[PDB]
Amino acid sequence: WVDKYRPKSLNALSHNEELTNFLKSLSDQPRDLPHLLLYGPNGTGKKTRCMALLESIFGPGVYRLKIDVRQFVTASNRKLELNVVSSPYHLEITPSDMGNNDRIVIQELLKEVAQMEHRYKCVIINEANSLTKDAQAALRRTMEKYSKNIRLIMVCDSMSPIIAPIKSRCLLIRCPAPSDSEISTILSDVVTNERIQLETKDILKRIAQASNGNLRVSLLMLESMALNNELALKSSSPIIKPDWIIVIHKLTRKIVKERSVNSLIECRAVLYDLLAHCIPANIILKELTFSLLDVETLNTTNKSSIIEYSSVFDERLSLGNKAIFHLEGFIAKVMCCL
Amino acid sequence: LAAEQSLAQQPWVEKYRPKNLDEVTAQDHAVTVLKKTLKSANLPHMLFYGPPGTGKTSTILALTKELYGPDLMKSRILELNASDERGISIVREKVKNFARLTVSKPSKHDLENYPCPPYKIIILDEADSMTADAQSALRRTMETYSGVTRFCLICNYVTRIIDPLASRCSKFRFKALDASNAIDRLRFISEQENVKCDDGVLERILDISAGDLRRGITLLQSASKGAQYLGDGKNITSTQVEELAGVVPHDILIEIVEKVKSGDFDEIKKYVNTFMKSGWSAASVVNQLHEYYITNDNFDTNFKNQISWLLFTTDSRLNNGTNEHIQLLNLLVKISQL
Amino acid sequence: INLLSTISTTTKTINHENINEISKAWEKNIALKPFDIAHKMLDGQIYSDIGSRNFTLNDKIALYFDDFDFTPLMIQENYLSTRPSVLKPGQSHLEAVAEAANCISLGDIVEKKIRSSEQLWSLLPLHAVLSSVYPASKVAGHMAGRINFTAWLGQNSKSAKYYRLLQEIHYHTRLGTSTDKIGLRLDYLPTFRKRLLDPFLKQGADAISSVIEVMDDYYLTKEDWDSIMEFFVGPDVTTAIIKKIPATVKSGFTRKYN
Amino acid sequence: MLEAKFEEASLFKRIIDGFKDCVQLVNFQCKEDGIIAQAVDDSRVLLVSLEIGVEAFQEYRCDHPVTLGMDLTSLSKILRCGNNTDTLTLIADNTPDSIILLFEDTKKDRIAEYSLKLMDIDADFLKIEELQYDSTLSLPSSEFSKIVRDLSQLSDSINIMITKETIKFVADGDIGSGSVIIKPFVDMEHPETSIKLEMDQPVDLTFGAKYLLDIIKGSSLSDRVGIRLSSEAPALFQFDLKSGFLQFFLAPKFN
Amino acid sequence: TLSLQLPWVEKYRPQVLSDIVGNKETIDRLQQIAKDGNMPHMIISGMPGIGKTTSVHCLAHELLGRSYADGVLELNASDDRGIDVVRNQIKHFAQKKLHLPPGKHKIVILDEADSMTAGAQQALRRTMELYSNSTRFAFACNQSNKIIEPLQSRCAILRYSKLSDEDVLKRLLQIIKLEDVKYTNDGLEAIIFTAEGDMRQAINNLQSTVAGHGLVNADNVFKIVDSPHPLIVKKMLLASNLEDSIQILRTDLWKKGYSSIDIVTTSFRVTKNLAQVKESVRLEMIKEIGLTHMRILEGVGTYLQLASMLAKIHKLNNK
Amino acid sequence: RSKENLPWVEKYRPETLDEVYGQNEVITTVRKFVDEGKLPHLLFYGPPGTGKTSTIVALAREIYGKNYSNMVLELNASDDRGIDVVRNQIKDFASTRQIFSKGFKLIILDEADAMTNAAQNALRRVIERYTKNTRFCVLANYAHKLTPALLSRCTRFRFQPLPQEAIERRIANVLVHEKLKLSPNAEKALIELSNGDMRRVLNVLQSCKATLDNPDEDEISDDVIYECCGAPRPSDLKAVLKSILEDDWGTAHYTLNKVRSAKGLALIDLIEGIVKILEDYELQNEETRVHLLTKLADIEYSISKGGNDQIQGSAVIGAIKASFENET
DNA sequence: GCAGACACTACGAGTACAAA
Ligand SMILES: Nc1ncnc2c1ncn2[C@@H]1O[C@H](COP(=O)(O)OP(=O)(O)OP(O)(O)=S)[C@@H](O)[C@H]1O
Ligand SMILES: Nc1ncnc2c1ncn2[C@@H]1O[C@H](COP(=O)(O)OP(=O)(O)OP(O)(O)=S)[C@@H](O)[C@H]1O
Ligand SMILES: Nc1ncnc2c1ncn2[C@@H]1O[C@H](COP(=O)(O)OP(=O)(O)OP(O)(O)=S)[C@@H](O)[C@H]1O
Ligand SMILES: Nc1ncnc2c1ncn2[C@@H]1O[C@H](COP(=O)(O)OP(=O)(O)O)[C@@H](O)[C@H]1O
Ligand SMILES: [Mg+2]
Ligand SMILES: [Mg+2]
Ligand SMILES: [Mg+2]
């Protein structure tokens, strides 16, 4: 399991030694630390690196986490509840759970910690891409005013959502995704400790290639193979793809095979099924676009038109509340292209 | 003494915040007017608008300190950011009440040492975030009460401010901080913190900053901390700064251009996937692509005209919060078709 | 009754000569039901050359403004179920549908700008054209089947409920799992199924303890288990599977957990 | 500096309560002769002119003319923050800012210090026009307040008519009408209950009910109120204090 | 000076039903009800300044004779017209006893009735019917859609129309004769054209022209009252060449001080109200002006964005 | 203070109707109205800083005298735009008589374009009913916000943007009151950059007096105006446009970058200068104008949202180059 | 002095946002 083996210190980090050394360099003198913005591909392990850096700054009780609930009131009398994951030396806030009221929790609770005050308490904004631009602009001055009491470490996957002033205010620490070799080494250690019999070692490299740099995905896929192959991985073990991936693949097959509005009916039905089951629309757009590009039949003109329409409707989705209104438009434009 | 040590151990962005108006490095066309208005007592209504990290807040925090003095500033200054709600109510209740109050009594010490002008300055940081209704409410609040209060609005984009509000305020544009104007200040900070650099390190830091001094200070602090952790005693090199600034290596950029030269969609897609398996930000990729293509003299004028518009469209989309992979692939494919 | 009372004061004979003016002056202007707005909006006669003079564009904006909360959704739901009759020479149904969908996306942008913190309600006439009038004009014609109600509301409520459930499970698993809300559903839940439901499918009633163990490894409850098993889609749908495990295993599982 | 002491701290409370409802912002100008206040309502229909004299204070010292601008609502709270058996002190520095109100009782040693931030009110017209009104009447405050409060229930407009030794208050509304007629009578056994009326030319003009109900709130200061009426002139409702007066200049409605 | 004269709008307000010029059929019906009696509940709808308040007041006065003081109840938007006024004031007024001529009844005039709250409108439904034997309600409103259908059912719907130029000319000629004002036919025609059927605006502009300049001429009237903004907007939109339209926008609109929001909104309204252009082209130009309107409302209001909007419109017209 | 410690925009506020320039038609017509006593309900609509509030305040001063702040109901509609104000303050003020002197009543509603629709729908009968004793003045920047009903009860006066003569006369008065001198070319630059707003010229004049080493012995040249405001010089605009138009891409980039860096010029100001100059041009084909205008509008809108300055500058260069490439 | 008794003010939930 991914939980069963997670580095708990900087010295236990095993991939991208450059980032490890940079984190130890920052932790050498922690009394002078600017705010951090970790970014990179999802599944790289940036959160673990944040925790290891935090452990190097403070004591090793940084992992003694406790969940607390802090009720708040919005502009209206509606009541919102946020669960804060907290530790004696730091706290975590994830605005993405709320909607457009994130500013409130950004503007009050953070300031409250500043009013409370190893002279600084680190606040980890796990989801800062989902932070509204208004919420970021509210955090703008909380970032500078209370810099002697509060020092933010903000975890991100894409810097583009975050406005320019915030990126200016914090040191940017890139997290490169582990290459297939280190992922294979980690998988080898995992199978060694978990006692998974391996027919050969090419299976680990195949898993690494099937995850596209994600270590969470690679480890979870390894476990999923171990539960379908009786804890003994063979050469011909089929790679387990998550359900949404097969649904998007079948949607791609339907789109390429049937370029009709009647087929658009079922495409909208499938998109509704995916959306209603806790799946973001931008990820659906990305996966569908890349799957459509991967189909061999289309010529280069069709692929270029598909990527153009995908870019346009990705912008449309980024500026639109109703997700299906843009995904169906993208699908219709692609079907018209073919 | 305590505050001196506190600022001595803080991020270099906050440690070297300009205490006085002279320490402003390159925004002379505004600080000169403020310095001469120190002698008089006719401070106009002011709108500080410029790129982030230029020095609007530092200038407006030094001006009040010089005009009123340390102790009296707290009484004669009201500061309202975007972290505080700034609707119609907070314009008609908090701001109006502060304006209506008579000017605080200057003490003897403040009068002998500091000019003590007969008004109070309301500093509205991030006035762009305010809704049009609140600005319309402030329109005449600034006017009728100009005798005892002065209004300063700081905004990143002047377009957000409504037309009459900008008309009333004296518009001060804080110029971008490139290498030429801020090299002296950066060298000053480096010398005070004993940072040892190669000839072009500070200038290169300023160019990567692209008109932002705060990013330059953060990069210099990161490089200095890394060098001190290394313990070699050598100087920070330009390549180290580029590594710590999220700059794509020249080899990878060259490989990107070679892949665009060979117009194969599949090869470009594969290399783009491998490239995005690293945290190379798409904006920093588009900037270097623009530099390489436009600067190079081996490209035709028509090709440059097309590629400039393509890069502009890609930047416009990428600044809206869309998916970096899709936009980067679209841009590279369209350049390949060129 | 009141019409006759008012009109009979001056004109003593109500006949076929003046009935047209009486109707034109006394007609009831009642806000149509959203189904009627959808029917008239997706009508070929409305956007034809002759029909446009009878029903001007302002009247179509008024039809939108009758109900400004549902017509955008009704048109989006029933703009692809009509046989078009205003197709330009050289255009198929799919091209008009794609243009209409692009217009609905632009209207969604306009609606978000209208219905956000800026509250730019002055764009309400514009949202009339982009969301309702333009796509309907693009795919105007005869109604193929029936006019269905907006499915967006129900699926949106379902998505809100599933998001709430995912929040509960994620915050229950937070103390062990280093993820966000979306990552859990995307990656962990497919793996969590293999360690929760599959042992009940294969090894039998003796899986409970093991299942309980992994349950107790992430502070899951029975409601949590039922919620996790309801998040899968497509091939891995578990609704039929949970029916096929024998009732003895279920009763033993609940009894052991309790 | 200003150091003005009221023996009866409840006196200033009652005067301030007299016009707290009518106006919110006031400029108390303290000179050597005493505190003088003038203010105008938001509707700009009623004017309030307080005139406190030196005799009112135990100890009044005003070195130089001073203007203290304040909000009536907060100052009313601050006055209510004091006991009845107290002495009051208004204190102001050389530069007018943050007036200090000081309640003392030395029978049981107790100090209560409060602050009120001054506010820059530009309007300082400070002018009234003494006129030869058409009619001058004087009647007990309780009777006039009773009459106004009972005729305010019928309509929002109350008409006052002054004729030869006759005072008429009329109120015509939607539920009906009402009219009370009184005559000026002089009572030797009890002088305080008498009614005086000196008329030069008969008057007929209307006021709003809300403003009359707010004016009669000053009946707690003096036991008798004077009313000066004239043809298209601000009606003068005066409550005479021991050292000065509180006068409401009301603007009648237009026919 | 201290005192001011009455505006000719209020001074020359029709005091008898015959003076009202336009909408002849409804006015004649109101005169017949005035003579006969038994006025039913009514809703008077139309555009501003075509004599809706004046008509109901002439009718009420003529019906109630000397009893206008007690039998007629004014309720205006300036007053509190919530459900409270229906419960307390309207109900008590309707329950009141009052002896009237044999045919006439007490009259409730609810001017600006379109702004009545939904609760008050619903509460009025039973007060309308229970006490109809004694009181008759009359509503006057610009928009009849705001009044609930249950209320609309119980009353006669009278819809007024915009006044034709001839009737405005007749009324203005009568006022001209009574007030001895010097005029020219061109000035009167310009006044009617600028009024656009709004008789109130016609009289106000006539009085203002007489006061400011002294002679009703085309030059003086056009000086005191601008040529309509929608007309120059329509001319700019329907220009043959881009440069001509740019010249109109620069000289007639931008240099004369009209704000960008005003130009964009008027362009949208002129486009949606245009008839010569085919519906598809009108819709696409509407889309372009919608994009421009979004840009203006986002703070970017300059001559460049409007010029780009016109360039897009001309591209759309030029295929 | 003595009205000398105030900003020049406020200290030079007109106090009499003879100190308001530019809107001579409106001033003369209103003066004649108030002299003959037939003053109708006024609606002054115009751009900011064109002198509507000053005009109405001076009108109140002339009609009522020095004590105009107690006998006129001046209400900032932005601060209070509710129907409660219409019911309570406005109607009570209109109905009653005056506490100070006999005469009619004036209600000055400033920024009534923010007034809510319910408030205006309530006021459309307060205006009509009490026309015997009160008159209403409505000040507006935008007339589209105001209800159509409130635009039929008020005589409309449009305030034109301030022309060269009136603005120049006001600068002459200011340089007379202070000890300052203005070069004719600097005055021309001030007028060009004013865009019809006296607030802009007053603010820039104060800033240019500030930037001088010492006032009353030095002059304010065009360099002072352009540097203090930060606006691009016409020479820089012409040089940038010439480099873009008739030379290779590399030196065009060099010229734009050097011009921007040396004087700190902003990109949007350069874009506005370039589009003005190119509008002054004569162009052979319409397609050039269409492409040029549409593109520059797109780059301007993108600049408003921020981004990469170099990319936007290159986009401007390419847009101009291609648009004039259509002219072959 | 001490307790209700209406009457005013503060709080909270629901609804509509345009154009002619
Ligand atoms: N002109 C300057 N001179 C010296 N240091 C500067 C200057 N501008 C910025 N800095 C440095 O950058 C820090 C941040 O400056 P700020 O004034 O907050 O930037 P900014 O204009 O407020 O940008 P925002 O708030 O995102 S719009 C200061 O504390 C200084 O360390
Ligand atoms: N048909 C008409 N004949 C004569 N005068 C008219 C006519 N219509 C309008 N007027 C003039 O315009 C003034 C206003 O009339 P009203 O009836 O009050 O306007 P309205 O039609 O009710 O529209 P409102 O008041 O905006 S809801 C009258 O006093 C007349 O001076
Ligand atoms: N015509 C003018 N003559 C002289 N000074 C003027 C003129 N117009 C504007 N000013 C100056 O500019 C200042 C602002 O004038 P205002 O009348 O307040 O602007 P405005 O016309 O009300 O526009 P707003 O407030 O944005 S709606 C005045 O105090 C004068 O100093
Ligand atoms: N050096 C490492 N050794 C072992 N596992 C790692 C390492 N780095 C990352 N991982 C694995 O990656 C998984 C996800 O990392 P996480 O920090 O959640 O990524 P992100 O925060 O980018 O979503 C973890 O379960 C962890 O086991
Ligand atoms: Mg700042
Ligand atoms: Mg009317
Ligand atoms: Mg103004």
Numbering used by the authors:
A (entry chain E): 4 to 120, 133 to 353
B (entry chain D): 16 to 353
C (entry chain A): 518 to 775
D (entry chain F): 1 to 255
E (entry chain B): 4 to 322
F (entry chain C): 8 to 335
Reproduce, without paraphrasing, sentences from the article in which this PDB structure was first reported.
To reveal how RFC binds to nicked DNA, we determined the cryo-EM structure of RFC:PCNA:ATPγS bound to nicked DNA (with a 5′ phosphate on the non-primer strand) to 3.7 Å overall resolution. Unlike the 5-gap and 6-gap structures that exhibit a 6-nucleotide ssDNA span that links the two duplexes, we observe an ssDNA stretch of 5 nucleotides in the nicked DNA structure. We observe DNA melting at both separation pins to create the ssDNA gap. We observe clear density for three melted nucleotides at the internal separation pin, with the nucleotides extruded through a cryptic channel that only appears upon RFC opening. We also observe one melted nucleotide at the external separation pin. Therefore, to account for the 5 nucleotides of ssDNA stretching between the two sites, there must be one additional melted base pair that we cannot directly observe. The melted region of the nonprimer strand is in a channel formed between the BRCT domain, the AAA+ module, and the collar.
Clamp loaders place circular sliding clamp proteins onto DNA so that clamp-binding partner proteins can synthesize, scan, and repair the genome. Here, we report the discovery of a second DNA binding site in the yeast clamp loader replication factor C (RFC) that aids in binding to nicked or gapped DNA. This DNA binding site is on the external surface and is only accessible in the open conformation of RFC. Here, we describe a series of structures that reveal that RFC has a second binding site for DNA on the external surface of RFC. This external DNA binding site is composite, consisting of three domains of Rfc1: the (BRCA1 C-Terminus) BRCT, AAA+, and collar domains.
